[PDB]
Design a protein around this ligand. Structure first.
Ligand SMILES: O=C(O)CNC(=O)C(=O)O
Ligand SMILES: [Mg+2]
Ligand code: NI
Ligand SMILES: [Zn+2]
Length: 331
């Protein structure tokens, strides 16, 4: 069995290997990359996402979100407070302000220490889930707006034709912006490209050990667990690496820098934080190997998780027994 310790693997495809996206994902899996839940892909030196980032300031962040924490430094939740609209140029100036800018630090490890010590005492502002793309249309390789759609994958594998679309989303971050512990909708894959700016640190639990993280989360968040049998779908709970180590939960960590892709694999729980002002693009995708994970994915039916239109069909076709309850949670 490849990668039996479930380490995060880093790939360096050549320009030739970068042509066929599906083939390269299958290659990484042949080497055991999915066992980690996360992989890093460094694009060939000849590749670029677009020519420059000099003209992005006028993109609108319609509903910036202030991420307010509650709890203790290593075990906390966050809620998202809506703020007034602002442009990317306005948001960048805000991220760089004395109130929000990255503090002086020695290296990524020192910054990680400062994040877990101090995150809860501040409320950073995030642009999230902004439909759009920063890939140039002429970028043919690994262009996250030109991938094969999940609806087409389901049709190819299972024969069923369904409604729905699959487009990418932009994220604008600043120091201490935080992504809570979660798997993707329907335990899909994700791909994330860091277009510009400061890094993102990721934490990940191997898919084969995801239920260990779920059991710890039920212990640490006991009222939320009573409220919903899939409350991590709410995407609000944080647990630090020190707490995970104290509780014996298997995990790994890695820092993504600008110009790098990260792939999350089905049922790989992940969480993390941004180091400073940045912009990322991400989208969900599927392969044949996902189908079995989609069929088994937990679902939130309490009303909190509310998701895209296109998840309806996935539930309806892959999880018909659950469909009526889940749809009630959507309405
Ligand atoms: O950029 C982001 O905020 C978050 N990305 C992910 O959790 C992902 O690609 O799965
Ligand atoms: Mg612009
Ligand atoms: Ni994710
Ligand atoms: Zn719920």
């Amino acid at each position: 069995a490849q990668n039996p310790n479930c380490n995060i693997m880093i790939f360096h495809p050549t320009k030739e290997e970068f042509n066929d996206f599906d083939k390269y994902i299958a290659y990484m899996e042949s080497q055991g990359a999915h066992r980690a839940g996360l992989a890093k892909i460094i694009p060939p030196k000849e590749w670029k996402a677009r020519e420059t980032y000099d003209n992005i300031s006028e993109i609108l962040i319609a509903t910036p979100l202030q991420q307010v924490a509650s709890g203790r430094a290593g075990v906390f939740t966050q809620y998202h407070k809506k703020k007034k609209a602002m442009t990317v140029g306005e948001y960048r100036h805000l991220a760089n302000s004395k109130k929000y800018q990255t503090p002086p630090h020695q290296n990524f490890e020192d910054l990680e220490r400062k994040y877990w010590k101090n995150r809860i005492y501040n409320s950073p502002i995030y642009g999230a889930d902004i439909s759009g793309s920063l890939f140039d249309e002429n970028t043919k390789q690994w262009n996250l707006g030109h991938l094969g759609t999940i609806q087409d994958l389901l049709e190819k594998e299972c024969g069923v034709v369904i409604e729905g679309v699959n487009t990418p989303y932009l994220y604008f971050g600043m120091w201490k912006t935080t992504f809570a512990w979660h798997t993707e909708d329907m335990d899909l894959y994700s791909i994330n490209y860091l277009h510009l700016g400061e890094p993102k640190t990721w934490y990940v639990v191997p898919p084969e050990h995801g239920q260990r993280l779920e059991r710890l989360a039920r212990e640490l968040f006991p009222g939320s667990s009573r409220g919903c049998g899939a409350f991590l779908r709410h995407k609000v709970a944080l647990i630090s690496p020190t707490v995970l180590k104290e509780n014996g939960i298997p995990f790994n960590r890695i820092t993504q820098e600008a110009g790098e892709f990260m792939v999350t694999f089905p049922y790989g729980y992940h969480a993390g934080f941004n180091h400073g002002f940045n912009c990322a693009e991400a989208i969900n995708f599927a392969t044949p190997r996902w189908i079995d994970y989609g069929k088994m994915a937990s679902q939130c039916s309490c009303g909190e998780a509310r998701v895209t239109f296109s998840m309806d069909a996935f539930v309806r076709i892959l999880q018909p027994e659950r469909y009526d309850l889940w749809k009630r949670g959507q309405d």
